[PDB]
C-alpha cells in the first residue's frame, strides 16, 4: 500500500478550471472526516483518462492553502483595516443592505407607465465558477429581489457565439464534444490556443493526427499549440474574415462543397427577395442617420402559405448559394494574402487541406475560443466558420462541427441558468416592459407553415410556464409572470450588460454591487477607471476563496482608505472538492462531483451563503414589510434545502422538474410528485414545473443521470467515443448536435466508418437522434424556424453575409474589399505616443486574473511575473534585451514587465508599414505574489462596441520602453 493514501477516503470530482471538464480522484484524511491528502486525475474518466494539466494537477495546493479566507470579514467606511465577524452578523447586515437599497429604489412602473417591478440600484457579477444548482438558485434569488443588472464571464467571451451559431444552426452551443476531435480528418485551430488553454483537448487532437488528420494553427503568434500543428499560418490581428471569405471562394471556385448536403440541409435553395442587395460594403435597407439596417429588406420570397420559396435545382439567381457565390468573388488569394499577411502559397496549402473535408467520408472541425471575437464583427467571424462547415457537410458529423471552446468549468451551465441580463434559465428572454402579459410574451414566437419543419421553439410557452411554476408553484404562471422584473423595451439591450454596469458605477448610479466569484478589479478592461468607480459604491459583497484586488480595492495602488467610503463584506466560499453539485463542460456534459474534505475553517458552499442571505431578507420583509414583497415571500426555497442545508440534489431535481398533479401528456399517464422524464412531457397549463427545460431528462425517476460513470458503448458509439452512459448532456443526451444532417434521406450515414446515427430496423442507432421522425421526413436543424442550416442569416445586425470591416482603427486607413472601412452599424484617439498594438492572452499555468493560481506556489514557480513578449525587430528598435525590465503604457495606465524577446512574435505589414505587436498576460495583480506585477487591464480601454458591449483586450494601442 501507499502510506499517503492508505487511511484516506477516495471520491471523484471534476476540475474547477477550464471547460474540458477533466475528472479528479480526491483522497481525504480520517476516512473523509479531515483535510485532503492527495488530488490527481481520474484514470476511469473517458475525457482525460487520468491526465491533468498543471492547473488540474495543483488543485491539492488550491484546496489545502493557508492563504485562503477562514471567516467573513468586514471593512467599515473610510477604514484602512479588515475586522473579522460571524456569519450571523455578515448576512443580517447584508440582508438589511439588500432590503434598504431595494425598498428605497424599487420601481413598480417605468416613466411610460409600464409594469417592470425592479431595482436598478443593485448590480451583480458572477459566476461560471459556481455549481449549476448554485447558478440557477442565484439567478432566481437576484430576480425575486428585482435585479435586471445580472452579468458574468459569459458576456466577454461566449456572447459573440450564441447568436452566430443560433442564426446558423438554431442553438448557441458547441456542436460536438472533446472526444469527437479524435474523429476529425483536418483540425483548424483559429482564435484558440487550446494546447495551453484547453490542454487535455490536445490528447484527442494528436489522436486525430495519429489517424492521418492535418492540424492547422492560424494565430498572430507562434504558441505551444503551433509547436504541435502540421501547418502554422501567421494572420495579422482582425484579418480573420478576409481569411475565411477567401476559403468560401476557394470552396465554390474548385467545387469542393458537399453538393447533396448543401441542397437538402442548408438554405442554399431558398429564394431571397428582390430587395436584398450588397453594394460598396453596405447591404440594402441601410439607415445612415441611425447607423442601423432595416432587415425586412433581406426577407426570403414566400410562397402562398408563408413558407420561403425553394429552387432545388439551385439555378434561380436569387438562390442563397448564387448570392453567396457573387458576394465572396471579391475575396481572391492576392487580396486575402496581402491583408492577412499569410503568403499566397500558405493560403493554398490551408485551403486545400481543409476544403478536402468537403468529401462525404471526410470530416473537418474548427476550434475557436475567445481569439479576437471581442470586436463588433466577432459574430460575423464565427458566422463564416458555420458557413464553411455547412458548405463542406461538416455539421452533424463525427470529427466535424463548430467546436466553440467554452472558457470556465461551468460557463456553459451559468449561461444556461440565465446569469446574463437578457435571458432567464433555458434561454427564455427576460421579458421587456412591452411584454405586459405572459400571453403577449408567448405571441413573440415565430411559426412555420412547412410541415417538414419541427420548429421546436414553438414549445416555449410550456418552458416559461413550467419555469414560473418552479419559482411560484402556488400561483398560476399567468399571475407569477408579474413578480419577476422587466427591462425597458425603449432602452438598448447593451445598457444592461457588463461594460455599461462599469459606466453606471463610475457615474455613482449603483448603491450595492455583488462581486460573486469574480475579480472585476483585474478582470474588467481599464482597471484604473473601475477601481476608482468601485469607490463610488455604498456597499460591496465579494464571495471568493481568498482576499483579492476586488475585496480590497480600497487599499489598492494610489488609493487612500480614509477617503473611500465603500462598506465591504468579504465572505470566504469553499473550493470545488469541498462541495457536491454539477458543472456543464463545453460539450454540454453535465457531470456530478462529490465532497472530498469538509469546508476549510468557516467557509461555506455558495449555495448556503446565498440561501441563508435570502432567508434573512425574507424574514426581514415578514417583520418590516416594504416594497412589493410578493416575489420574495412566495419564492419556493423549501425545494432547495434538506436538513437546514442547501441541497444540490433537490435543486437538481427541481431544475429537471416534476409533475405538480396527475397528468396525461404525449399519450402517457404520470402521478403527482413524479420526475419529468424529458422536456417533451412539460406543459403550459401548470401540470409540470421545471427550473430549466434543458435539464428535463437529467434527473428522472430512473435516478441522477449526471452522476452516471458507465463506459458501456455499442460498437458504433465506441468507434466515435459518444460515451452516452457517462454522465448526461443536454438536450436529452444528444452528444453531437444536428446529427440528422449526418445521414441521407434513407437514413444511411455519409461516413459509415464514423456513423453518428444510422436507421436500422425501424429506429435510429448510435447517438440520440437530434429530432424525431423517419429518414427524409424532417429538416435536420429542428431549432431553426425554416429547419435549414443557414448560409444566408438575415437576423444578424451587420448583414446576412459576413463582410470584412476593419476592427483595427489606428494602423489601417483603407479596406481592400469596399469603400466601407469600419462596421457601419457601430472614437479611439490613436495618440502617436502609443505606436504599437498591445494584446492580452493566457499561459497554460495561470487562471483568469490569477486570483487562484497566484496563490499556488507551484504555478508561481513556473510563471512568477508579468512578462511582455516582443519580436527581435522591436527589441532592436527600443534597445530591449531579453530579460530587461520594460514600461508598457497607454492613455489608460502603465506597468512594468520582464521583456521576452522571441521570433514567435513578428511585425505585421499594414499598408506598406511595419506595425509591431506586443503581448501581455492578464494573470497578474498587486496583491500576490511579491514582484508579480499588476493586471494588463491597467492598459486596456473601456470604450466598447455599441453592438456587443464588450471592451477591447486583443488590439489596443501601447508604448513599450526599456527601464
Amino acid at each position: 500500500e501507499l502510506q499517503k493514501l492508505q487511511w484516506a477516503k477516495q471520491t471523484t470530482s471534476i476540475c474547477c478550471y477550464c471547460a474540458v471538464g477533466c475528472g479528479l480522484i480526491v483522497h481525504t484524511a480520517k476516512d473523509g472526516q479531515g483535510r485532503a491528502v492527495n488530488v490527481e486525475g481520474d484514470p476511469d474518466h473517458p475525457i482525460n483518462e487520468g491526465s491533468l494539466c498543471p492547473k488540474g494537477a495543483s488543485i491539492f495546493q488550491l484546496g489545502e492553502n493557508d492563504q485562503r479566507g477562514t471567516q467573513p470579514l468586514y471593512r467599515a467606511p473610510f477604514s484602512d483595516t479588515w475586522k473579522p465577524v460571524t456569519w450571523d452578523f455578515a448576512l443580517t447586515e447584508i440582508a438589511k443592505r439588500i432590503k434598504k437599497t431595494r425598498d428605497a429604489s424599487f420601481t413598480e412602473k417605468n416613466a411610460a407607465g409600464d409594469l417592470v417591478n425592479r431595482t436598478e440600484a443593485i448590480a451583480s457579477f458572477g459566476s461560471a465558477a459556481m455549481d449549476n444548482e448554485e447558478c440557477w438558485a442565484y439567478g432566481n434569488i437576484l430576480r425575486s429581489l428585482g435585479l435586471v443588472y445580472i452579468e458574468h464571464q459569459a458576456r466577454i467571451x461566449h456572447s459573440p457565439t450564441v447568436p452566430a451559431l443560433a442564426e446558423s444552426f438554431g442553438r448557441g452551443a458547441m456542436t460536438n464534444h472533446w472526444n469527437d476531435l479524435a474523429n476529425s480528418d483536418c483540425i483548424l485551430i483559429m482564435g484558440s490556443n487550446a494546447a495551453e488553454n484547453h490542454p487535455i483537448a490536445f490528447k484527442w487532437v494528436l489522436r486525430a493526427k495519429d489517424k492521418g488528420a492535418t492540424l492547422i494553427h492560424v494565430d498572430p503568434r507562434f504558441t505551444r499549440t503551433s509547436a504541435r500543428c502540421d501547418v502554422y499560418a501567421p494572420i495579422r490581428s482582425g484579418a480573420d474574415i478576409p481569411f475565411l471569405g477567401g476559403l468560401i471562394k476557394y470552396i465554390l471556385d474548385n467545387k469542393l462543397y458537399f453538393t447533396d448536403y448543401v441542397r437538402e440541409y442548408t438554405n442554399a435553395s431558398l429564394i431571397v427577395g428582390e430587395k436584398f442587395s450588397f453594394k460598396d460594403g453596405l447591404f440594402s435597407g441601410y439607415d445612415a442617420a441611425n447607423k442601423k439596417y432595416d432587415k425586412s429588406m433581406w426577407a426570403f420570397e414566400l410562397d402562398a402559405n408563408g413558407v420561403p420559396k425553394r429552387d432545388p435545382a439551385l439555378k434561380h439567381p436569387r438562390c442563397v448559394i448564387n448570392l453567396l457565390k457573387k458576394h465572396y468573388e471579391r475575396y481572391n488569394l492576392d487580396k486575402v494574402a496581402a491583408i492577412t499577411g499569410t503568403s499566397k502559397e500558405q493560403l493554398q496549402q490551408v485551403y486545400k487541406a481543409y476544403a478536402a473535408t468537403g468529401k462525404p467520408d471526410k470530416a473537418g472541425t474548427i476550434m475557436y475560443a475567445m481569439g479576437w471575437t471581442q470586436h463588433s464583427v466577432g459574430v460575423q467571424n464565427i458566422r463564416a466558420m458555420a458557413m464553411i462547415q455547412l458548405l463542406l457537410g461538416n455539421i452533424g458529423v463525427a470529427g466535424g462541427g463548430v467546436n466553440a471552446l467554452r472558457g470556465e468549468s461551468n460557463v456553459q451551465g451559468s449561461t444556461d441558468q440565465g446569469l446574463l441580463a437578457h435571458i432567464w434559465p433555458g434561454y427564455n428572454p427576460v421579458p421587456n416592459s412591452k411584454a405586459a402579459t405572459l400571453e403577449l410574451y408567448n405571441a413573440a414566437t415565430p411559426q412555420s407553415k412547412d410541415p417538414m419543419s419541427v420548429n421546436w421553439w414553438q414549445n416555449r410557452p410550456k418552458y416559461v410556464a413550467s419555469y414560473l411554476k418552479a419559482l411560484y408553484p402556488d400561483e398560476e404562471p399567468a399571475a407569477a409572470y408579474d413578480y419577476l422584473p422587466r427591462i425597458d423595451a425603449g432602452r438598448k439591450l447593451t445598457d444592461y450588460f457588463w461594460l455599461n454596469i462599469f459606466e453606471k458605477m463610475d457615474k455613482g448610479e449603483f448603491k450595492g454591487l455583488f462581486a460573486w466569484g469574480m475579480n472585476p478589479a483585474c478582470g474588467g478592461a481599464n482597471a484604473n477607471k473601475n477601481r476608482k468607480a468601485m469607490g463610488k459604491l455604498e456597499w460591496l459583497v465579494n464571495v471568493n476563496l481568498f482576499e483579492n484586488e476586488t475585496s480590497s480595492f480600497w487599499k489598492g495602488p494610489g488609493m487612500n482608505p480614509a477617503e473611500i467610503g465603500t462598506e465591504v463584506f468579504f465572505l470566504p466560499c469553499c473550493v470545488s472538492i469541498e462541495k457536491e453539485g454539477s458543472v456543464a463542460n463545453s460539450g454540454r456534459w453535465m457531470q456530478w462531483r462529490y465532497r472530498g474534505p469538509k469546508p476549510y475553517a468557516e467557509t461555506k458552499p455558495d449555495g448556503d451563503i446565498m440561501l441563508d442571505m435570502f432567508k434573512k431578507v425574507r424574514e426581514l420583509y415578514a417583520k418590516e414589510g416594504g416594497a412589493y414583497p410578493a416575489p420574495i415571500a412566495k419564492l419556493n426555497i423549501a425545494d432547495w434545502e434538506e436538513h437546514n442545508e442547501f441541497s444540490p440534489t433537490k435543486v437538481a431535481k427541481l431544475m429537471n422538474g416534476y409533475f405538480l398533479k396527475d397528468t396525461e401528456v404525449g399519450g402517457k399517464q404520470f402521478k403527482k410528485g413524479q420526475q419529468v422524464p424529458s422536456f417533451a412531457f412539460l406543459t403550459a397549463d401548470g401540470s409540470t414545473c421545471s427550473g430549466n427545460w434543458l435539464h428535463a431528462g437529467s434527473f428522472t425517476d430512473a435516478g441522477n443521470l449526471m452522476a452516471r460513470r458507465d463506459k458501456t458503448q455499442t460498437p458504433e458509439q465506441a468507434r466515435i467515443g459518444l460515451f452516452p452512459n457517462w454522465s448526461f448532456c443536454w438536450p436529452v443526451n444528444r452528444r453531437i448536435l444536428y446529427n440528422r444532417a449526418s445521414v441521407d434521406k434513407t437514413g444511411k450515414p455519409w461516413n459509415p466508418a464514423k456513423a453518428v446515427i444510422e436507421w436500422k430496423d425501424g429506429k435510429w442507432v448510435g447517438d440520440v437522434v437530434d429530432g424525431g421522425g423517419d429518414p427524409g421526413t424532417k429538416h435536420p436543424f429542428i431549432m431553426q424556424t425554416h429547419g435549414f442550416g443557414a448560409l444566408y442569416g438575415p437576423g444578424r445586425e451587420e448583414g446576412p453575409f459576413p463582410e470584412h470591416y476593419e476592427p483595427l482603427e489606428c494602423p489601417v486607413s483603407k479596406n481592400p474589399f469596399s469603400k466601407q472601412l469600419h462596421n457601419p452599424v457601430a472614437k479611439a484617439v490613436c495618440d502617436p505616443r502609443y505606436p504599437f498594438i498591445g494584446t492580452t492572452y493566457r499561459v497554460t499555468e495561470h487562471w483568469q486574473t490569477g486570483l487562484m493560481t497566484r496563490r499556488c506556489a507551484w504555478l508561481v514557480e513556473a510563471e512568477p511575473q508579468i512578462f511582455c513578449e516582443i519580436s527581435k525587430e522591436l527589441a532592436k528598435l527600443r534597445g530591449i534585451g531579453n530579460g530587461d525590465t520594460v514600461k508598457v503604457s497607454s492613455l489608460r495606465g502603465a506597468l512594468e514587465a520582464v521583456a521576452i524577446v522571441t521570433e514567435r512574435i513578428r511585425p505585421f505589414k499594414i499598408e506598406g508599414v511595419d506595425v509591431h505587436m506586443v503581448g501581455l498576460p492578464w494573470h497578474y495583480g498587486w496583491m500576490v505574489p511579491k514582484n508579480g506585477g499588476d493586471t494588463a487591464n491597467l492598459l486596456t480601454p473601456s470604450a466598447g462596441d455599441p453592438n456587443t458591449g464588450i471592451p477591447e483586450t486583443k488590439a489596443f494601442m501601447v508604448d513599450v520602453r526599456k527601464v
Binding site: 484514470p43 491539492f60 507562434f222 509547436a227
Partner: protein, 214 residues
C-alpha cells in the same frame, strides 16, 4: 524491469508533469524570477526533480522549432552514480531488482556530492546545501511497486509520457521512431541501450539540452 518512453514530438510543454511530480511528493516551490523565458525553475535542484527546458530554434518560413525537454534521471542500466558512491559507501545509491530504479538513500549525506554528480553523464544529481543529501527523480518506485503509473506519466495529456515493461517500451519506441521520422526525418532515440528513460528527439538531442544524451 520498467522503462519510460518519452515521445518529445507530442509535448505541448503544458508542465503538468512538473507540477504533478511536486504534488505527489509534496515538494516545496523555489523562489523564481522571469529572466526572459517561460522556463522555470531554470534548472533541477534538491526540491525540483523535473523541470521542462524551452529552446527556440530559427527556421525558414513562419514560426520556429520550439523544443521542449522534461528532464529526469535516466535510471541507467549500469548506473555511473552508484559506481562512484559505492567507493565511499555501498548503500547511499542502490538499484531495485524488480523495477530497475536507481534510488538515492539517506546515506548519500555520507558521500562526496559533486563526485556523484560529475560521474553522471546527464548532470542529474543535485545537493541540499544544508544536509548534503542527494535527490533526483526516484521513478515513483513507491507507485510502480503498487501498480500505479509515475505521477508525471499519468498526468501527461499528449501521449509524450509512456511507461511499462522494457520489452513493450523498446517495441513502442522503435515503431514510433519509424512513424515520427515520416514528419521529422532526423528523429533519434537517446542512448536506448544504456537507460530506462528513452527520449525520442525530433532532431539533434543537443538542441534540446547540452546533456540530453551521453
Amino acid at each position: 524491469g520498467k522503462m519510460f518512453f518519452v515521445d518529445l514530438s507530442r509535448c505541448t510543454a503544458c508542465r503538468g508533469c512538473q507540477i504533478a511530480c511536486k504534488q505527489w511528493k509534496n515538494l516545496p516551490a523555489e523562489e523564481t524570477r522571469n529572466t526572459g523565458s517561460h522556463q522555470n525553475p531554470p534548472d533541477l535542484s534538491y526540491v525540483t526533480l523535473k523541470t521542462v527546458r524551452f529552446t527556440e530554434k530559427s527556421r525558414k518560413g513562419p514560426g520556429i522549432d520550439w523544443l521542449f525537454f522534461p528532464e529526469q534521471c535516466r535510471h541507467c542500466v549500469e548506473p555511473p552514480c552508484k559506481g562512484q558512491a559505492d567507493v565511499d559507501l555501498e548503500g547511499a545509491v542502490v538499484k531495485d531488482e524488480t523495477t530497475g530504479a536507481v534510488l538515492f538513500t539517506e546515506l548519500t549525506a555520507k558521500v562526496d556530492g559533486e563526485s556523484v554528480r560529475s560521474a553522471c553523464p546527464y548532470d542529474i544529481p543535485r545537493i541540499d546545501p544544508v544536509t548534503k543529501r542527494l535527490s533526483k527523480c526516484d521513478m515513483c518506485n513507491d507507485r510502480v511497486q503498487n501498480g500505479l503509473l509515475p505521477a508525471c506519466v499519468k498526468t501527461c495529456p499528449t501521449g509524450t509520457m509512456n511507461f511499462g515493461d522494457e520489452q513493450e517500451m523498446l517495441a513502442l519506441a522503435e515503431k514510433r521512431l519509424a512513424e515520427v521520422k515520416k514528419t521529422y526525418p532526423g528523429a533519434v532515440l537517446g542512448d536506448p541501450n544504456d537507460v530506462r528513460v528513452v527520449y525520442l528527439f525530433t532532431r539533434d538531442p543537443k538542441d534540446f539540452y547540452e546533456h540530453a544524451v551521453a
